[PDB]
Design a protein around this nucleic acid. Structure first.
Ligand code: SF4
Ligand SMILES: [Mg+2]
Ligand SMILES: [Mg+2]
Ligand SMILES: [Mg+2]
Ligand SMILES: [Mg+2]
Ligand SMILES: [Mg+2]
Ligand SMILES: [Mg+2]
Ligand SMILES: [Mg+2]
Ligand SMILES: [Mg+2]
Ligand SMILES: [Mg+2]
Ligand SMILES: [Mg+2]
Ligand SMILES: [Mg+2]
Ligand SMILES: [Mg+2]
Ligand SMILES: [Mg+2]
Ligand SMILES: [Mg+2]
Ligand SMILES: [Mg+2]
Ligand SMILES: [Mg+2]
Ligand SMILES: [Mg+2]
Ligand SMILES: [Mg+2]
Ligand SMILES: [Mg+2]
Ligand SMILES: [Mg+2]
Ligand SMILES: [Mg+2]
Ligand SMILES: [Mg+2]
Ligand SMILES: [Mg+2]
Ligand SMILES: [Mg+2]
Ligand SMILES: [Mg+2]
Ligand SMILES: [Mg+2]
Ligand SMILES: [Mg+2]
Ligand SMILES: [Mg+2]
Ligand SMILES: [Mg+2]
Ligand SMILES: [Mg+2]
Ligand SMILES: [Mg+2]
Ligand SMILES: [Mg+2]
Ligand SMILES: [Mg+2]
Ligand SMILES: [Mg+2]
Ligand SMILES: [Mg+2]
Ligand SMILES: [Mg+2]
Ligand SMILES: [Mg+2]
Ligand SMILES: [Mg+2]
Ligand SMILES: [Mg+2]
Ligand SMILES: [Mg+2]
Ligand SMILES: [Mg+2]
Ligand SMILES: [Mg+2]
Ligand SMILES: [Mg+2]
Ligand SMILES: [Mg+2]
Ligand SMILES: [Mg+2]
Ligand SMILES: [Mg+2]
Ligand SMILES: [Mg+2]
Ligand SMILES: [Mg+2]
Ligand SMILES: [Mg+2]
Ligand SMILES: [Mg+2]
Ligand SMILES: [Mg+2]
Ligand SMILES: [Mg+2]
Ligand SMILES: [Mg+2]
Ligand SMILES: [Mg+2]
Ligand SMILES: [Mg+2]
Ligand SMILES: [Mg+2]
Ligand SMILES: [Mg+2]
Ligand SMILES: [Mg+2]
Ligand SMILES: [Mg+2]
Ligand SMILES: [Mg+2]
Ligand SMILES: [Mg+2]
Ligand SMILES: [Mg+2]
Ligand SMILES: [Mg+2]
Ligand SMILES: [Mg+2]
Ligand SMILES: [Mg+2]
Ligand SMILES: [Mg+2]
Ligand SMILES: [Mg+2]
Ligand SMILES: [Mg+2]
Ligand SMILES: [Mg+2]
Ligand SMILES: [Mg+2]
Ligand SMILES: [Mg+2]
Ligand SMILES: [Mg+2]
Ligand SMILES: [Mg+2]
Ligand SMILES: [Mg+2]
Ligand SMILES: [Mg+2]
Ligand SMILES: [Mg+2]
Ligand SMILES: [Mg+2]
Ligand SMILES: [Mg+2]
Ligand SMILES: [Mg+2]
Ligand SMILES: [Mg+2]
Ligand SMILES: [Mg+2]
Ligand SMILES: [Mg+2]
Ligand SMILES: [Mg+2]
Ligand SMILES: [Mg+2]
Ligand SMILES: [Mg+2]
Ligand SMILES: [Mg+2]
Ligand SMILES: [Mg+2]
Ligand SMILES: [Mg+2]
Ligand SMILES: [Mg+2]
Ligand SMILES: [Mg+2]
Ligand SMILES: [Mg+2]
Ligand SMILES: [Mg+2]
Ligand SMILES: [Mg+2]
Ligand SMILES: [Mg+2]
Ligand SMILES: [Mg+2]
Ligand SMILES: [Mg+2]
Ligand SMILES: [Mg+2]
Ligand SMILES: [Mg+2]
Ligand SMILES: [Mg+2]
Ligand SMILES: [Mg+2]
Ligand SMILES: [Mg+2]
Ligand SMILES: [Mg+2]
Ligand SMILES: [Mg+2]
Ligand SMILES: [Mg+2]
Ligand SMILES: [Mg+2]
Ligand SMILES: [Mg+2]
Ligand SMILES: [Mg+2]
Ligand SMILES: [Mg+2]
Ligand SMILES: [Mg+2]
Ligand SMILES: [Mg+2]
Ligand SMILES: [Mg+2]
Ligand SMILES: [Mg+2]
Ligand SMILES: [Mg+2]
Ligand SMILES: [Mg+2]
Ligand SMILES: [Mg+2]
Ligand SMILES: [Mg+2]
Ligand SMILES: [Mg+2]
Ligand SMILES: [Mg+2]
Ligand SMILES: [Mg+2]
Ligand SMILES: [Mg+2]
Lengths: 96, 208, 82, 99
RNA sequence: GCCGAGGGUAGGGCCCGUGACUGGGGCGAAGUCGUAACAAGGUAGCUGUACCGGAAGGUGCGGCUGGAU
RNA sequence: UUGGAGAGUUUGAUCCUGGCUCAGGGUGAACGCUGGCGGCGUGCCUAAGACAUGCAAGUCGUGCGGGCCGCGGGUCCGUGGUCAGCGGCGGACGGGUGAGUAACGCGUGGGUGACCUACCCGGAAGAGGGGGACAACCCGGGGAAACUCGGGCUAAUCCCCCAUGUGGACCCGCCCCUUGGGGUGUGUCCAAAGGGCUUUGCCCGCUUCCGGAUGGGCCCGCGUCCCAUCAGCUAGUUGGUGGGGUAAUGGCCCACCAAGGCGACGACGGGUAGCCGGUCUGAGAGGAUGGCCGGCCACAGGGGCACUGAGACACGGGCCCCACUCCUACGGGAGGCAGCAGUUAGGAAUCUUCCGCAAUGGGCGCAAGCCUGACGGAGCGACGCCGCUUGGAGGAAGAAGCCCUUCGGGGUGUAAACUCCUGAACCCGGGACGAAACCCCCGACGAGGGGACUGACGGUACCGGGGUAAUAGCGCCGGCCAACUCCGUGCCAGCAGCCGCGGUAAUACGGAGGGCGCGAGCGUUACCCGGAUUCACUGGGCGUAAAGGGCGUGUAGGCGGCCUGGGGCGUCCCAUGUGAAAGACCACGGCUCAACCGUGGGGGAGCGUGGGAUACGCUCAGGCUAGACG
């Protein structure tokens, strides 16, 4: 009338919290950056972006995002950001 | 199982003597030698000409009732030779012959095939050494078929080898009498064996 | 891992293995990658074990993993030899 | 090899897309005779350079859109309206087949 | 907040089972009525159509020979 | 060239057309009568209706901290067994079923510069320094139960920050390539864990990256049933742009923009079916089929959805809704056999609540070892195939009984009786093969050599000794079609696949004698192919037998004269890749044979690629006048 599949569901819920938690943050700082570079304000935009990329590749280390996901996310992060600076500029930090 | 019943009614129907007992087949107490006409209430009436189908069934039971063989084993043995290379007729006869229960009899180990069965099924026979109690063994060239030593001192097999002292046995078989051992040289050409049977007609029975 | 093991053929009370390379996740007698010999545990034939040894080594050099009673059958046919 | 087909453009009424009809002959599997069957493909003309009646070559490519799986390889011939009219007239005959 | 299993309201399409009663159909048969067809079948037959008659059918119009002499 | 039989029936008779019917092989069969043994297969085809009970997935103390009990011995330690917990790996394999699906589901040949892969191998490099949570546990509250919330502490291979950057990722630039592939420079971002022995040395693991191997996702060409009495279908529809999303392409999803996409070469719709290797039949061509077994797919009470994850939108995991059943302490809560058995319902119909991890295989583990209804065997069922038995030799011009008779006799019938010979069954003794690995040993934990432990089936098969004459049934006997007489019946009773039998001498009904055919079987019903050249590709027809459109004109389509060249599409050849395994076939070999099973051999179409051929059909080009028109 039971087993260890219960143990495994209890585990799945605790990892669930951790996964969502990063994703919201990751998506939070991503928008926060892209938000800034649009009205850039290049330096702050570029600065916050470094905490985006950081928080991304760390998520990539585990179960959160697979390798190609983090890559996919950054290429849409940066490409959006830099070209938003082409509407003004200039890129005050790195990078790159 | 096998036919296992009154056997003179068999020859009487076929119109021909088949040698289904042994000793009595030769004496004048043989049924065909008293009544060469089909058994039962209507045997002495004048026959009516049998149809093609009538003729073939009859030639089949002829060859078949010789061997004391079931229709299944007959059919399957036949439907082997139908598939396997060459001329069907000879091979069917050949594969018919390679039966142990037949082989035992052609050598004169037994007086009938019916006795050659009880000889085989009661283990009194051996093939190249090993005891064999299977009437259906397909004996192959080079096989040496002999009596078991443990039964070699039996009235029936001793007495039945007594006739065989210099008796003829078909070309493809050799026989060390007294020593109680024989040898299978090869499967027959239609010539070697003169069964009272037109073998082509059996193919044609089955072509229907 | 891709594994080397004995897919059972033959018949009841008549075992007959095919030493083979198949996915570890396959069913024991399922479709395999390559056949590399046979094995007859009843030894009722002159040669109850034969192995193309050059082939088995290809897999080993690349990561196939023998079962215990296959590891032995390769040892008896001396694939492990130096 | 990426299957390359030869056929006629019969409609270019979309942006960056052509309709390349490909035809084929083979003998009828039971009745022997060689028979004509054909098919329309949507081909990616990114360079929107191809016109009605062009005979071209197309190559199976990675998916562009739904349905679109071929890009146009190269021009083969120009101005074969006689063929487009073959296609176009069979359509016009469909009106006389209803109720 | 969107989409959303499905629940609910309303109107449509195809199919199936069934229905007082009704239309002809098959078979059964030892029934009633007539005798239309097969002989020139006793008005040559068949025919599309039209009108009519208890029923086979008849008649008009045109057609066919697959009509005896 | 290993391969091909036909008959009955329209007539007074004939020839022909045409159907009906039959003899064959086959089945996951069922039903009737009958039934002895064994081997190998094989067994809910119906309600993917509903299900009591047990069992089908766990494992690791060589990751961590504990509670209890014990051996040890000084409240403490080592250590053992056990129970949960945290953390790993597995649970996406294996096993079931065919509902749904006419579809890129499957089959076959290919694309991926548009992609992923835990454990495994190989190649390069690394493991430095801190911090923190939640269960266990203690303490409260609430129940019959499911159990449940709160408060407080604690360890780690549990989470997090910094450092190192072999390497990787991303944006911008250049080169190479050519769909997002390879290379590099500026910038920025990302690593990690210890455990254990024999202890400055090894073993299991960890981290980043590259290659390999294996398993997948996605895409394309071609092939895949019936109704045209379904003829027109389409708004995410078809394409573009920009984003969202994923490992990845894509209307997969959203916004905007364009007016498009599909269809008689059958769209849309309705019906039916999971597809294949193959199986069955057939001379072949073809037809029929997809149970067992192997491959793929789909589903897990009916639907929807995601989470954890390398991998699932997950049969024995989660959430929700519905239908259904249950338990209760009446306040509330639980279940999902299309896993193995088993119950029930439906049905003409389809099994033991077995034994075992010994073997093969899978999962966890350094290893011992633990789990394994996968599997190995056992049980039941003539369901199928195969082997086998109910005895063999002798024995009368031939017992009795019964059948027939011209009353002379004919038959069952060597059949029986009886004589000898053999010895299924059973009794006694021996007794397997399947099982040598892991481990241990020396060596080096390797190469190699040596050692011991292990058998559910089973005291079974088999081997040896003894020993009893030891089950036969079922269909048919008018023609097809093999086998005939007497009585009883009197168009009655009944038989029947077709033609036909029965109205007082029925070989056709019922019994008997006799006979014919098979034999632990024989018949019957149902269905598939054959006979049916009766959908005719092989291989048919249309004056009167069924069958020429009432006649024109013309759309698509099918088809096309004589000569020459270009191409080489159809077509032919060659070389190569693929065409898995089982099965089929040929040889051999193992079970005493066989069924069954093992080993080897031989191929094919069909498709991918390369090269060649150019007569015919194709295409393009240039001529001609015999076809056609003027
Ligand atoms: S006796 Fe004559 S009939 Fe009776 S069996 Fe011997 S041969 Fe045949
Ligand atoms: Mg667990
Ligand atoms: Mg927010
Ligand atoms: Mg995930
Ligand atoms: Mg990751
Ligand atoms: Mg003779
Ligand atoms: Mg003749
Ligand atoms: Mg032959
Ligand atoms: Mg003779
Ligand atoms: Mg035949
Ligand atoms: Mg088409
Ligand atoms: Mg697009
Ligand atoms: Mg809705
Ligand atoms: Mg609705
Ligand atoms: Mg609701
Ligand atoms: Mg009605
Ligand atoms: Mg009515
Ligand atoms: Mg009525
Ligand atoms: Mg009249
Ligand atoms: Mg008249
Ligand atoms: Mg008249
Ligand atoms: Mg008239
Ligand atoms: Mg009146
Ligand atoms: Mg009138
Ligand atoms: Mg006229
Ligand atoms: Mg020929
Ligand atoms: Mg025939
Ligand atoms: Mg008649
Ligand atoms: Mg007539
Ligand atoms: Mg008549
Ligand atoms: Mg006929
Ligand atoms: Mg039959
Ligand atoms: Mg029965
Ligand atoms: Mg019974
Ligand atoms: Mg059995
Ligand atoms: Mg079922
Ligand atoms: Mg019901
Ligand atoms: Mg019910
Ligand atoms: Mg158990
Ligand atoms: Mg460990
Ligand atoms: Mg333990
Ligand atoms: Mg534990
Ligand atoms: Mg599974
Ligand atoms: Mg499965
Ligand atoms: Mg199974
Ligand atoms: Mg199905
Ligand atoms: Mg459909
Ligand atoms: Mg495909
Ligand atoms: Mg398709
Ligand atoms: Mg494929
Ligand atoms: Mg620490
Ligand atoms: Mg701490
Ligand atoms: Mg760092
Ligand atoms: Mg049609
Ligand atoms: Mg796009
Ligand atoms: Mg769409
Ligand atoms: Mg839109
Ligand atoms: Mg349906
Ligand atoms: Mg179905
Ligand atoms: Mg035929
Ligand atoms: Mg089918
Ligand atoms: Mg079936
Ligand atoms: Mg299957
Ligand atoms: Mg479903
Ligand atoms: Mg159910
Ligand atoms: Mg459900
Ligand atoms: Mg469901
Ligand atoms: Mg995992
Ligand atoms: Mg995924
Ligand atoms: Mg699960
Ligand atoms: Mg689930
Ligand atoms: Mg699923
Ligand atoms: Mg279940
Ligand atoms: Mg309960
Ligand atoms: Mg209460
Ligand atoms: Mg509740
Ligand atoms: Mg239960
Ligand atoms: Mg019932
Ligand atoms: Mg049952
Ligand atoms: Mg079974
Ligand atoms: Mg085991
Ligand atoms: Mg094991
Ligand atoms: Mg291990
Ligand atoms: Mg267990
Ligand atoms: Mg069990
Ligand atoms: Mg089993
Ligand atoms: Mg007499
Ligand atoms: Mg007599
Ligand atoms: Mg008498
Ligand atoms: Mg008498
Ligand atoms: Mg006798
Ligand atoms: Mg053993
Ligand atoms: Mg005795
Ligand atoms: Mg019969
Ligand atoms: Mg017959
Ligand atoms: Mg007769
Ligand atoms: Mg009476
Ligand atoms: Mg009478
Ligand atoms: Mg009769
Ligand atoms: Mg009678
Ligand atoms: Mg038998
Ligand atoms: Mg039967
Ligand atoms: Mg038929
Ligand atoms: Mg035909
Ligand atoms: Mg024809
Ligand atoms: Mg005809
Ligand atoms: Mg005419
Ligand atoms: Mg008209
Ligand atoms: Mg015309
Ligand atoms: Mg034309
Ligand atoms: Mg033409
Ligand atoms: Mg020409
Ligand atoms: Mg030419
Ligand atoms: Mg060509
Ligand atoms: Mg080939
Ligand atoms: Mg093959
Ligand atoms: Mg042999
Ligand atoms: Mg062949
Ligand atoms: Mg030429
Ligand atoms: Mg010309
Ligand atoms: Mg002219």
């Amino acid at each position: 009338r039971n087993l260890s599949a219960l143990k495994r569901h209890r585990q799945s819920l605790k990892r669930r919290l951790r996964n969502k938690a990063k994703k919201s943050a990751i998506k939070t700082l991503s928008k926060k950056a892209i938000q800034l570079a649009q009205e850039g304000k290049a330096e702050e935009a570029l600065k916050i972006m470094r905490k985006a990329e950081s928080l991304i590749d760390k998520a990539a280390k585990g179960s959160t995002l697979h390798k190609n996901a983090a890559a996919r996310r950054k290429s849409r992060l940066m490409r959006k950001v830099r070209q938003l600076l082409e509407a003004a500029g200039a890129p005050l930090i790195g990078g790159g | 199982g096998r036919y296992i019943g009154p056997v003179c009614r068999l020859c009487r129907r076929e119109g021909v003597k088949l040698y289904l007992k042994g000793e009595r087949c030769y004496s004048p107490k043989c049924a065909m030698e008293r009544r060469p006409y089909p058994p039962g209430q209507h045997g002495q009436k004048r026959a009516r000409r049998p149809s093609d189908y009538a003729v073939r069934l009859r030639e089949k039971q002829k060859l078949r009732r010789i061997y004391g063989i079931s229709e299944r084993q007959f059919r399957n043995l036949f439907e082997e030779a139908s598939k396997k290379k060459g001329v069907t007729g000879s091979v069917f006869l050949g594969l018919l012959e390679s039966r142990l229960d037949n082989v035992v009899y052609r050598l004169g180990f037994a007086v009938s095939r019916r006795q050659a069965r009880q000889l085989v099924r009661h283990g009194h026979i051996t093939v190249n050494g090993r005891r064999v109690d299977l009437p259906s063994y397909r004996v192959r060239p080079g096989d040496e078929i002999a009596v078991a030593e443990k039964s070699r001192n039996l009235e029936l097999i001793r007495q039945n080898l007594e006739a065989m002292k210099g008796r003829k046995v078909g070309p493809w078989l050799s026989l060390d009498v007294e020593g109680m051992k024989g040898k299978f040289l090869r499967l027959p050409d239609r010539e070697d064996l003169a069964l009272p049977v037109n073998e082509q007609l059996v193919i044609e029975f089955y072509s229907r | 891992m891709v594994k080397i093991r004995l897919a059972r053929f033959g018949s009841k009370h008549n075992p007959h293995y095919r030493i083979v390379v198949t996915d570890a996740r396959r069913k024991r007698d399922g479709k395999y990658i390559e056949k590399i010999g046979y094995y007859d545990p009843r030894k009722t034939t002159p040669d109850w074990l034969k192995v193309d040894v050059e082939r088995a080594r290809y897999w080993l050099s690349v990561g196939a993993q023998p079962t215990d009673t296959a590891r032995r059958l390769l040892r008896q046919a001396g694939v492990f030899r130096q | 090899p990426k299957k390359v087909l030869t056929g006629v453009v019969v409609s270019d009424k979309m942006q960056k897309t052509v309709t390349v009809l490909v035809e084929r002959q083979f003998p009828h599997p039971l009745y022997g005779k060689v028979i004509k069957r054909s098919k329309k493909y949507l081909a990616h003309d990114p360079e929107e350079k191809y016109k009605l009646g062009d005979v071209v070559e197309i190559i199976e490519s990675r998916p562009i859109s739904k349905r679109k799986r071929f890009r146009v390889l190269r021009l083969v011939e120009s101005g074969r309206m006689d063929l487009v009219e073959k296609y176009l007239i069979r359509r016009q005959n469909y009106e006389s087949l209803s109720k």
